[PDB]
């Protein structure tokens, strides 16, 4: 029913409102594949509920001080967002600004893949 | 008042029996630190609930095909276990054998740190 442009707009709006979990629950495909930019073993994730667990883990391990979302930028079945996060990881305790691009693939109205570039 | 030997034996038996969640809830300190060997997205974790999420994430992304837990091996305030198990990560769909050593630090009856060696 909704077009990629509408899905992209709603999802981005939700993230700008800081409603990351609502955005994910609403739009992620049951089998969403998520690919972190950082090299390593748990970079790749499969499954909507797995991703929710990873997202909760990430919130428990970072203090988010602020941030912005720019986009959506659309091309065909995908949209890109540009994220800037002001965060203190518990792992380091050293405040940093993270700058990345997320690329979201949409099929049948659900995000089937998210890939982050850093 | 449980000795390290007692805690170690109970925790090990629980892991051998497959009660990973029970061992974690019974013994992990609220501020437990978990360190993978691999660098990567969930390589360093802090908090008991964070570890529960990481652990659920891991379970959802791997099929475990058996294996064994050897130990506990004790010295002072710590114990070590050796884990050898076949697993199929959802990311690759290719079955591999994992062989790792876990080192557990106990303070006031609770596991304050777990550290994995690969």
Backbone angles phi, psi at A115, to 5 degrees: -130, 130
DSSP 8-state class, residue A93 = -
Note whether A41 contacts B38, CB cutoff 8 Å: yes
Taking residue A3's Cβ as centre, other Cβ atoms within 10 Å add up to 11
Number of domains in chain A: 1
Residues of chain A positioned with their CB less than 8 A from the CB of B56: 50, 53
Angle at A41 between CA B118 and CA B83, to 5 degrees: 35
Contact A90 B46 (CB under 8 A): yes
Helix runs in A2-69, H state only: 4-16, 20-27, 48-61
Q: Which residues of A, range 78-97, sit inside 8 Å of B by Cβ?
A: 90-91
Q: Cα–Cα distance between A79 and A107 in angstroms, integer?
A: 12
Burial of A72 (0-12, 13-18, 19+ CB in 10 A): buried
Whether the ω angle into residue A92 lies within 30 degrees of 0, i.e. cis, is no
Structural domain harbouring B47: 1-118
In B, which residues are within 8 Å of A91 by CB distance?
Answer: 43-46
CA–CA separation, B7 and B29 (whole Å): 13
CATH number at residue B47: 3.10.450.50
Closest by CA to A105, choosing from A19, A31, A16, is A31
Separation of alpha carbons B89 and B58, rounded Å: 9
Nearest CA in chain B to A93: B46
Query: CA-to-CA distance for B50 and A90, rounded, in angstroms?
Result: 11
- Per-residue CA distances from A73 to A18, A22, A68, A111 (Å): 19, 21, 15, 15
List Cα–Cα distances, A25 to A28, A42, A52, A111, B91, in angstroms. Answer: 6, 21, 8, 10, 22
Cβ neighbours, 10 Å, residue A61: 19
CA A86 to chain CA centroid, nearest Å: 15
- Experimental determination approach used: X-ray
What is the number of other CB atoms lying within 10 angstroms of the CB of residue A107? 10
CA–CA distance, B13 with B15 (Å, rounded to integer): 5
- The torsion angles phi and psi of A113, rounded to 5 degrees, stand at -150, 145
Is A53 near chain B, with CB under 8 Å? yes
Sequence-distant (≥ 6) Cβ neighbours of residue A89 within 8 angstroms:
A61, A62, A96
Query: Exposed/middle/buried for B53, CB within 10 Å: 0-12, 13-18, 19+?
Result: buried
């Amino acid at each position: 029913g909704m077009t990629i442009a509408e899905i992209a707009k709603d999802f981005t709006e939700l993230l700008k409102q800081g409603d990351n979990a609502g955005a994910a629950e609403k739009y992620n495909a049951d089998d969403i594949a998520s690919y972190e930019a950082m090299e390593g073993p748990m970079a790749v994730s499969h499954g909507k509920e797995a991703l929710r667990q990873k997202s909760q883990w990430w919130q428990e391990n970072h203090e988010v001080h602020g941030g912005s979302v720019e986009g959506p930028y659309v091309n065909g079945d995908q949209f890109a967002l540009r994220f800037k996060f002001d965060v203190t990881p518990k792992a380091t305790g050293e405040r940093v600004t993270m700058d990345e691009v997320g690329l979201y693939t949409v099929k049948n109205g659900k995000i089937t893949e998210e890939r982050f570039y850093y």
